[PDB]
Amino acid sequence: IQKVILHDVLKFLFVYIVFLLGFGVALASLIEKCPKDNKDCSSYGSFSDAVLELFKLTIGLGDLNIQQNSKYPILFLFLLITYVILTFVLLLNMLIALMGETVENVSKESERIWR
Amino acid sequence: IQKVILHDVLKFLFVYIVFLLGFGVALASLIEKCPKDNKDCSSYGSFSDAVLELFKLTIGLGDLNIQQNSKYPILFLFLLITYVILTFVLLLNMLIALMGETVENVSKESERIWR
Ligand SMILES: CCCCCCCC/C=C\CCCCCCCC(=O)O[C@@H](COC(=O)CCCCCCCCCCCCCCC)COP(=O)([O-])OCC[N+](C)(C)C
Ligand SMILES: CCCCCCCC/C=C\CCCCCCCC(=O)O[C@@H](COC(=O)CCCCCCCCCCCCCCC)COP(=O)([O-])OCC[N+](C)(C)C
Ligand SMILES: CCCCCCCC/C=C\CCCCCCCC(=O)O[C@@H](COC(=O)CCCCCCCCCCCCCCC)COP(=O)([O-])OCC[N+](C)(C)C
Ligand SMILES: CCCCCCCC/C=C\CCCCCCCC(=O)O[C@@H](COC(=O)CCCCCCCCCCCCCCC)COP(=O)([O-])OCC[N+](C)(C)C
Ligand SMILES: CCCCCCCC/C=C\CCCCCCCC(=O)O[C@@H](COC(=O)CCCCCCCCCCCCCCC)COP(=O)([O-])OCC[N+](C)(C)C
Ligand SMILES: CCCCCCCC/C=C\CCCCCCCC(=O)O[C@@H](COC(=O)CCCCCCCCCCCCCCC)COP(=O)([O-])OCC[N+](C)(C)C
Ligand SMILES: CCCCCCCC/C=C\CCCCCCCC(=O)O[C@@H](COC(=O)CCCCCCCCCCCCCCC)COP(=O)([O-])OCC[N+](C)(C)C
Ligand SMILES: CCCCCCCC/C=C\CCCCCCCC(=O)O[C@@H](COC(=O)CCCCCCCCCCCCCCC)COP(=O)([O-])OCC[N+](C)(C)C
Ligand code: NA
Numbered sequence: 668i669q670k671v672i673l674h675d676v677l678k679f680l681f682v683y684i685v686f687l688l689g690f691g692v693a694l695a696s697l698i699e700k701c702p703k704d705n706k707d708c709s710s711y712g713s714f715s716d717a718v719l720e721l722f723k724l725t726i727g728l729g730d731l732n733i734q735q736n737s738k739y740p741i742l743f744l745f746l747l748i749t750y751v752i753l754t755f756v757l758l759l760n761m762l763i764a765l766m767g768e769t770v771e772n773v774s775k776e777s778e779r780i781w782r
Numbered sequence: 783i784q785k786v787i788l789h790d791v792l793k794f795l796f797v798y799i800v801f802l803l804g805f806g807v808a809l810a811s812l813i814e815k816c817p818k819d820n821k822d823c824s825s826y827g828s829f830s831d832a833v834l835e836l837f838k839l840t841i842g843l844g845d846l847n848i849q850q851n852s853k854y855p856i857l858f859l860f861l862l863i864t865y866v867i868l869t870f871v872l873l874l875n876m877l878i879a880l881m882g883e884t885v886e887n888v889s890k891e892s893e894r895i896w897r
């Protein structure tokens with residue numbers, strides 16, 4: 668756990684943000700602006716609405732209220748489907764990177780420095 | 783299945799609770815208290831609200847009703863995003879631990895004691 672966090676998480680994060688902001692500037696032009704009614708509008712901007720929904724859709728707390736009230740609702744959904752596929756590729760190459768060149772030598776280096 | 787449950791689950795759980803209670807005492811100070819209205823308030827405390835939502839967000843039954851009605855709503859969300867990343871690191875090192883030093887010797891010890 669100390670080997671992944673101190674060494675191998677910043678590999679995952681720095682490629683995640685460029686995939687976050689890559690779809691972040693794309694989805695922000697699709698989102699219709701919050702001041703349509705201003706009765707329950709407490710948003711933080713057009714760019715801020717697009718990025719915060721990509722956090723919630725990754726951790727599993729996403730909704731569909733913005734996808735319905737959008738400019739192009741079908742085109743807004745296909746970038747969300749593509750975002751899941753790119754996220755799964757990021758999660759699947761983290762396992763291959765933690766199996767670097769031998770699955771035993773990872774268990775060796777955690778056993779030597781434990782003692 | 784009998785090898786993971788009897789031997790290898792308590793490795794996962796005892797590191798999960800210290801990551802549960804680590805964010806449990808942190809998120810409990812962010813949650814605004816339930817007696818605001820007392821018409822549908824049947825909570826079990828400030829600490830009990832923070833821990834039970836981390837069970838639901840892990841198993842996939844989480845909501846966003848408390849994150850909206852919080853003190854710092856953006857700061858409440860970033861600890862939930864960090865909690866998913868730490869949970870995924872816990873789930874990803876369980877697979878490397880079950881592949882300890884050879885993927886064949888795990889299949890050997892389950893074949894010898896079956897006979
Ligand atoms: C403005 C400048 C550029 C900025 C952008 C780039 C900045 C640079 C960022 C990442 C690249 C690493 C560069 C470090 C030095 C270079 C030498 C090197 O090869 O790297 C290595 C040195 O490993 C490290 O030292 C990791 C650097 C983080 C140190 C601790 C910081 C706290 C992490 C807090 C984390 C967040 C908290 C978590 C929860 C939120 C890395 O190699 P490895 O990854 O160990 O691979 C080993 C795998 N293998 C053996 C199987 C093959
Ligand atoms: C790896 C990191 C991430 C990867 C990148 C992220 C993924 C990139 C994916 C997509 C990039 C962004 C797509 C939408 C961009 C425009 C949106 C928009 O503002 O609509 C507005 C503009 O209306 C238009 O003129 C265009 C409408 C959408 C066109 C769809 C084609 C692109 C689909 C993809 C195919 C491209 C091929 C791509 C190559 C494979 C509509 O607003 P309006 O008010 O109703 O109309 C008035 C017009 N006015 C405002 C100017 C006056
Ligand atoms: C290391 C990263 C974290 C730290 C750096 C943060 C990076 C910036 C990320 C996010 C912005 C957070 C601070 C900016 C202003 C406050 C909020 C806001 O955006 O709304 C503003 C407009 O809303 C917009 O639409 C502006 C967003 C587009 C420009 C910002 C992205 C810059 C590059 C992307 C990142 C490139 C680098 C990323 C590489 C990792 C209005 O503000 P407000 O809503 O009315 O709230 C008041 C603010 N207050 C209460 C605080 C006074
Ligand atoms: C990797 C997979 C992810 C997808 C691609 C990833 C890249 C994504 C990038 C770009 C992708 C292409 C963008 C298309 C834009 C939508 C336009 C449209 O369809 O017409 C209409 C919808 O009509 C429908 O409802 C059709 C149903 C939609 C899904 C089709 C079923 C798939 C079955 C077959 C299986 C194949 C499955 C897909 C192939 C693999 C209108 O849609 P609109 O424009 O939003 O409405 C605005 C109204 N306006 C224009 C009048 C203002
Ligand atoms: C009070 C203060 C302390 C309390 C905190 C600490 C308490 C101690 C807790 C865990 C540490 C284990 C210590 C046990 C003896 C020490 C010897 C040893 O090295 O451990 C080993 C002895 O393996 C075991 O005996 C596991 C202990 C559980 C026994 C059955 C209890 C029911 C499990 C119910 C489960 C919950 C029900 C599931 C659904 C909810 C463990 O090693 P391993 O894991 O087998 O590694 C093998 C992997 N490899 C070969 C690939 C390398
Ligand atoms: C591995 C296991 C997990 C790890 C740990 C888990 C994660 C730990 C993360 C974070 C730990 C907890 C952060 C919040 C704590 C205070 C919250 C609070 O009660 O607010 C109250 C206090 O108001 C304040 O004075 C502070 C408000 C928040 C400040 C945010 C900075 C810390 C962010 C993180 C950066 C730290 C660097 C961390 C190092 C990387 C507001 O209440 P009020 O009534 O509106 O105001 C009246 C004030 N009064 C009540 C006193 C009179
Ligand atoms: C082995 C672990 C399981 C067993 C031990 C459980 C340990 C405690 C865990 C969970 C609590 C369960 C029992 C405590 C009291 C009852 C409920 C409650 O909390 O609400 C109370 C206040 O609410 C609070 O805010 C108190 C929470 C902070 C102190 C508890 C953490 C102890 C240290 C961290 C954990 C220790 C380390 C654990 C490491 C594994 C009020 O109670 P009530 O809501 O009005 O309901 C009436 C109660 N009755 C119906 C039952 C009569
Ligand atoms: C591993 C990743 C997890 C995150 C870090 C892990 C550690 C987490 C610990 C601490 C984290 C840092 C503390 C943040 C506190 C929020 C304050 C704030 O932003 O201002 C304002 C919000 O304004 C906005 O809405 C800004 C938009 C939010 C997200 C920015 C987009 C990210 C794009 C860039 C890509 C970078 C993505 C992130 C970098 C990787 C106010 O927000 P508030 O305070 O809640 O409201 C209370 C009002 N009050 C103050 C008046 C009472
Ligand atoms: Na779900």
Ligand code: NA
Pocket residue numbers: none
């Ligand atoms: Na899943």
Ligand code: NA
Pocket residue numbers: 770881885
């Ligand atoms: Na293998």
